[PDB]
């Protein structure tokens, strides 16, 4: 509720009014402090969601994502204070302002009690990210990249706007509790499909499914490090949160209309993971891997099965923490080599031995190696999907088989092998990069002991 | 032009628009339109360049024709009803007659062809007056006579306004032509909701007023008229380019910025009126405005265009303008979404 | 207050102050021809405001303390450097000319602003209308690429059109062998190496172009060196014109009010100088331009608006 | 020379200025202090107590309360001999099914 919001927004005057060089320090202090307070919100009751007021409420689904976003907030500050050191204090302050303003919106939307209120800051997250990708992005095609990312989501979000207000004029309020209790069987009338399509496509776009995913490779690669993590670790997941919330009034229409997306997602994950097997760009390879994992959640959410929701929430968080880490891996390597081609800097393990380890559990976590939370996600989803149909395991398991090859492919090409002779600027890794990397992996294994925290309201 | 003469000329233009909004008699409505026209031309003639003369001539011909065509709508309504009161009129042909007569003054349908060109010829300050204040008078009549309008005829005029107004905007270099094409696009949004509920037709008006004051007076402060000229302003005053990109995003309608408030309420109303295809298409065309909005934002502040060594003098000196009401303009034009339920005050 | 519209309405006119000592006389000539010496003598003997030749740091002179700022911070060009390698690849030649054109264009405004606000005539060296003689000279030997002419002209019409021409122009006629005579006595090693061709190419463009086409809108009186030193002779000659041709003996308070609007706004007068046409000599990339701007901004006094810099001692910032 | 620009700056090594550099910022004293913040306010106060806080969080989802009720409920049910959990949930005796 408020105990998270005002501390987040009151953090903004601090960064603006802090000393010239202390900006990174005091921002990091209370961002971690905010994370601690958010963790206090992680508690949930049995069945009734933790409701605070007409404006804000939390459930067993929102809380794990809330603590994840606040937990993220220190990490971009940690990950960004290397390529922004040679910048004017105002621009550094502006950069920090963008992140916490972005993070502030995330707390708002996840705790939003009204769908329209959920909707207003659903796209409002775009404005800070658009600035981050465009201004501080370090590339040339970032301009076209920002346009692709911006227009795709709007093209899907605006139908939701017309759909959402239609609910208000037809079924009174759009309070999440009032929708759930007063749910009615959506008919099969040919208007209700376009009703169904509008209420779904908005979350489809910013949850890249095959076909509606070309923004993500352009979104991730040209975005700066902080932009890439926030976009891949939370931003691809507003779509996820919407579906678990909005599919309450899409049944039984979801039963019949689910087919085109399920085939698109299940086949897409094989295709996308195949792209990972032959990606020339390390950041792009990680980006395409996010599509495969996210497309798995598409099948998870859209099956509408108790087990499927549970594994979704497991992959909901685990992928986000993992994808942020892998982007950190690529970023921590990038500036040393000043290039994105994977084969540019081979045999890094012989030069940097600890990064060899950090890359190693990172690849293992993305492998869904048990008992990592990723395995709990994928394995739960497979069982739910298998109950839905026996055939899907052929597609399901094949993804894990492909996921194995490309995951260690980056490991062998970069970490193992012969070091590149020509390069000589690879310095011993700063303990900031090392500290940040453990900041990611350590909570992941810490979460393994308590899956019930992140299983969700279906748990 | 002598400032005292200039002040009076603006004073009559304001009063002429004020006269339209306060007249219960159709003849006086026409009086306000013509005497507002009678003093609009000299303001466009203040610079007195051959481009301005072409602009002023274009503006007068279309406005005089629309106003003269407006008389028959009054006369025909007179002929069939004998009522000079401005109310729900009593002739479909007369109702049709004035609707394009007023539309030409606003420039929504192909009628809109004068709107861009006149803005290009005349000065930035004059364009600000033309695209903001000169749109209250034609709107005032439409609000009063909204109950008599043919829904099909007005919705169409609104559609091509946002449709063409947004579509051609992708192909404009000069910022003045960009603003006019934005104006035509925004014209459709208010006009579309006009038959349904006039309350948020006004709400769109003051809000759309706010950015156009915000943008134009920002542009005047920049003293730039082209995209490239605007780009160089990052070197001189990077802060101004920062606010302009906020307004550019806001005028585009991205939440939670102010410009989203009109469009959101507009979609809500016609959705209540069972018209649900119509709002969807306008929202789709809304991104068309956002594109060249982004292109300007990309050129202005998001990127950093090359500058010229001659910019160094501009650093040494300072601006002498006072940009009155600029501080409160952009703030009221970018973050007012939380104060949305205040629209009932308009009712 | 200033000439803001309230001032003009309340009664502040322009024709009341100006008198017969209201002229835009320019003393001008070839390089080192002693025009600046004669310009001072006219200024002293007429009670007429003098304006020294606008250098690279003339704009620096107007702003702040008037101390010439760093060439990197103001000019990116050196006349001495242009002397060493007139055809340098860095574009020191055209950058010098364009900056010089801006400096004198600012000087022209400062003269008009003082003249209109005081009624006292102004004498300045090498008015902007005569600035083309150098660029023409720098074009004949290829000191600048051909395209520099069009850009310099393009700035000229979009700026010099509004600034109306002087009243009477003083020309110190000096032949090239004489120009080749004094510049040894000057001593500065950079100006020894000036080519006799350059001293020639300014001369004919001065002779066959500057004087005749501009003569139809103001009086022109040619003086050689002897009539240049004769301050008594030239000064009564200046007093002995009616000054009919030119726009000046036609306008009223309406134009002067508008003219003082543009000139008073120091951003507007050179607003069109930063024209967005891109050429290698004058265009500076984003990284270099941004870094210099930070270096300019971190300077004292320039951090905020004038009267708003606490570092120099602007007290009551919380109340201003 | 296209434009008067600056050459690409070379990436400075924080180590060669100060060998103990931690990569957080240039100035050594704040860099050492940034170490203290990122670890003390990172691993120390969040990971350690936060884990204990969430680990020792009170009954979440009533995972054990339901067990105790089930044990009592099942102990009641087979004692009387009726089936230990009915196939129906909302007692059909009240239900007023149409026709």
């Amino acid at each position: 509720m408020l105990k998270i919001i005002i501390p987040t927004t009151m953090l903004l005057p601090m960064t603006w009014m802090s000393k010239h060089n202390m900006i990174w320090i005091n921002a990091t202090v209370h961002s971690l402090l905010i994370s601690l307070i958010s963790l206090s919100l992680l508690n949930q009751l049995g069945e009734n969601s933790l409701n605070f007021s007409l404006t804000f409420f939390s459930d067993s689904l929102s809380a794990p994502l809330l603590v994840l976003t606040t937990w993220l907030l220190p990490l971009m500050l940690m990950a960004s204070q290397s390529h922004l050191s040679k910048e004017t204090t105002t621009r550094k302050k502006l950069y920090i302002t963008m992140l916490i303003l972005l993070q502030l919106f995330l707390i708002m939307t996840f705790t939003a009690t009204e769908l329209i209120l959920f909707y207003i800051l659903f796209e409002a997250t775009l404005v800070p990210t658009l600035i981050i990708i465009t201004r501080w992005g370090n590339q040339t095609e970032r301009l076209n990249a920002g346009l692709y990312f911006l227009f795709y989501t709007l093209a899907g979000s605006l139908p939701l706007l017309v759909a959402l207000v239609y609910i208000q004029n037809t079924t009174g309020s759009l309070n999440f509790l009032i929708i759930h209790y007063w749910s009615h069987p959506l008919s099969n009338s040919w208007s209700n499909i376009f009703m169904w399509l509008a209420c779904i496509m908005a979350f489809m776009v910013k949850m890249p499914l095959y076909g509606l995913h070309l923004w993500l490779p352009k979104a991730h690669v040209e975005a700066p490090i902080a932009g890439s993590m926030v976009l891949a670790a939370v931003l691809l997941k507003l779509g996820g949160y919407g579906m678990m919330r909005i599919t309450t009034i899409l049944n039984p229409l979801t039963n019949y209309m689910a087919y085109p997306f399920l085939m698109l997602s299940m086949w897409g994950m094989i295709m996308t993971s195949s792209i990972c097997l032959r990606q020339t760009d390390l950041k792009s390879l990680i980006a395409y891997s996010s599509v495969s994992h996210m497309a798995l959640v598409i099948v998870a959410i859209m099956i509408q099965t108790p087990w499927s929701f549970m594994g979704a929430t497991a992959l909901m968080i685990a992928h986000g923490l993992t994808s942020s880490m892998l982007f950190c891996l690529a970023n921590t390597n990038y500036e040393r080599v000043h290039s994105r081609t994977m084969i540019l800097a081979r045999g890094l393990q012989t030069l940097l031995p600890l990064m060899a380890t950090w890359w190693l559990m990172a690849s293992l976590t993305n492998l869904a190696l048990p008992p990592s939370i990723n395995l709990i996600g994928e394995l739960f989803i497979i069982t739910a999907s298998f109950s839905w149909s026996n055939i899907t395991i052929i597609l399901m398991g094949m993804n894990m088989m492909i996921t194995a090859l490309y995951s260690l492919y980056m490991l062998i090409t970069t970490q193992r092998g012969k070091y590149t002779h020509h390069i000589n600027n690879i310095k011993a890794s700063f303990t900031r990069e090392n500290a940040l990397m453990a900041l990611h992996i350590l909570p992941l294994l810490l979460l393994t002991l308590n899956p019930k925290m992140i299983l969700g309201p279906l748990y | 032009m002598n400032p005292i003469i200039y002040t009076t000329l603006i004073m009559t233009v304001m009063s002429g628009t004020m006269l339209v909004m306060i007249s219960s008699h159709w003849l006086l409505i026409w009086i306000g339109f013509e005497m507002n026209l009678l003093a609009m031309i000299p303001v466009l003639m203040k610079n007195f360049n051959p481009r301005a003369t072409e602009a002023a001539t274009k503006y007068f011909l279309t406005q005089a024709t629309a106003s003269m065509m407006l008389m028959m709508a009054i006369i025909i309504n007179l002929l069939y009803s004998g009522q000079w009161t401005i109310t729900k009129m009593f002739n479909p042909v007369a109702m049709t007659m004035m609707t394009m007569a007023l539309a030409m003054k606003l420039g929504l349908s192909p009628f809109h062809f004068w709107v861009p060109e006149v803005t290009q010829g005349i000065s930035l300050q004059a364009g600000l007056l033309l695209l903001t204040w000169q749109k209250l008078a034609p709107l005032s009549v439409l609000c009063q006579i909204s109950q008599s309008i043919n829904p099909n005829l007005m919705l169409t005029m609104a559609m091509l306004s946002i449709l063409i107004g947004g579509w051609g905007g992708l192909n404009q270099t000069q910022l003045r032509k960009i603003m006019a094409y934005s104006s035509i696009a925004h014209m459709g949004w208010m006009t579309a909701v006009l038959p349904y509920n006039t309350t948020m037709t006004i709400l769109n008006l003051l809000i759309y007023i706010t950015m156009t004051l915000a943008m134009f007076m920002l542009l005047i402060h920049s003293s730039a008229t082209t995209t490239l000229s605007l780009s160089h302003t990052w070197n001189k005053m990077p802060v101004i380019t920062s606010l302009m990109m906020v307004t550019l995003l806001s005028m585009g309608g991205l939440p939670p910025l102010s410009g989203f408030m009109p469009k959101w309420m507009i979609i809500q109303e016609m959705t209540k009126n069972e018209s649900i295809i119509m709002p969807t298409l306008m929202a789709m065309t809304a991104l068309l405005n956002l594109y060249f909005y982004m292109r300007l934002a990309y050129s202005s502040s998001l990127t950093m265009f090359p500058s010229t060594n001659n910019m160094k003098m501009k650093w040494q000196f300072e601006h002498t303008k006072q940009m009155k009401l600029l501080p409160t303009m952009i703030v009221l034009s970018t973050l007012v979404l939380p104060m949305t339920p205040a629209l009932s005050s308009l009712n | 207050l200033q000439y803001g519209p309230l001032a003009f309405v309340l009664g502040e006119r322009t024709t009341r102050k100006l008198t017969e000592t209201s002229k835009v006389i320019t003393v001008d000539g070839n390089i080192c021809s002693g025009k600046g010496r004669l310009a001072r003598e006219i200024a002293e003997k007429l009670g007429l405001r003098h304006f020294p030749e606008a250098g690279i740091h003339y704009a620096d002179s107007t702003t702040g303390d008037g101390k010439p700022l760093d060439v990197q911070l103001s000019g990116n060009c050196s006349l001495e450097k242009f002397y060493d390698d007139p055809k340098s690849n860095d574009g020191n030649s055209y950058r010098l000319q364009s900056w010089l054109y801006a400096s004198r264009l600012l000087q022209y405004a400062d003269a008009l602003e003082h003249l209109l606000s005081t009624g006292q005539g102004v004498v300045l060296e090498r008015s902007i209308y005569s600035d083309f003689v150098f660029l023409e000279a720098m074009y004949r030997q290829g000191f600048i690429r051909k395209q520099c002419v069009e850009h310099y002209n393009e700035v000229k019409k979009v700026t010099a059109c509004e600034y109306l021409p002087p009243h009477v122009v003083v020309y110190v006629d000096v032949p090239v062998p004489e120009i080749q005579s004094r510049i040894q006595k000057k001593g500065n090693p950079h100006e020894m190496k000036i080519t006799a061709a350059y001293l020639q190419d300014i001369e004919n463009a001065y002779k066959k172009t500057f004087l005749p086409e501009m003569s139809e809108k103001c009086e022109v009186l040619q003086y050689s060196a002897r009539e240049a030193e004769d301050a008594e002779k030239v000064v009564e000659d200046i007093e002995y014109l009616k000054c009919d041709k030119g726009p000046w003996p036609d306008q009223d308070d309406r134009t002067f009010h508008r003219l003082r609007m543009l000139v008073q706004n120091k951003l507007e007068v050179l607003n069109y100088t930063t024209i967005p046409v891109y050429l290698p000599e004058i265009t500076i990339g984003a990284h270099q331009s941004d870094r210099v701007f930070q270096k300019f901004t971190e300077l004292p006094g320039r951090k905020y608006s004038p009267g708003y810099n606490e570092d120099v001692g602007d007290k009551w910032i919380w109340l201003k | 020379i296209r434009l008067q620009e600056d050459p690409d700056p070379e990436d400075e090594n924080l180590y060669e200025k100060n060998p103990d550099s931690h990569g957080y910022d240039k100035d050594p004293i704040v860099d050492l202090w940034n170490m203290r913040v990122v670890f003390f306010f990172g691993f120390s106060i969040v990971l350690v107590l936060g884990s204990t806080f969430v680990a020792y969080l009170p009954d979440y989802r009533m995972q054990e309360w339901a067990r105790r009720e089930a044990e009592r409920l099942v102990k009641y049910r087979e004692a009387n001999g009726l089936p230990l959990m009915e196939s129906n949930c909302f007692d059909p005796n009240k239900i007023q099914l149409p026709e």
Binding site: - | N171, T173, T227, T303 | - | -
Partner: peptide
């Protein structure tokens, strides 16, 4: 350093129309 627009990007946005044709060529 991050890429910044140059005369290639500027002239792309410079002219009568960024979407030109033979009709708009003159």
């Amino acid at each position: 350093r991050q890429w910044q627009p140059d005369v290639e990007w500027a002239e792309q946005f410079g002219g009568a129309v960024m979407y030109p044709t033979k009709e708009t060529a003159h």
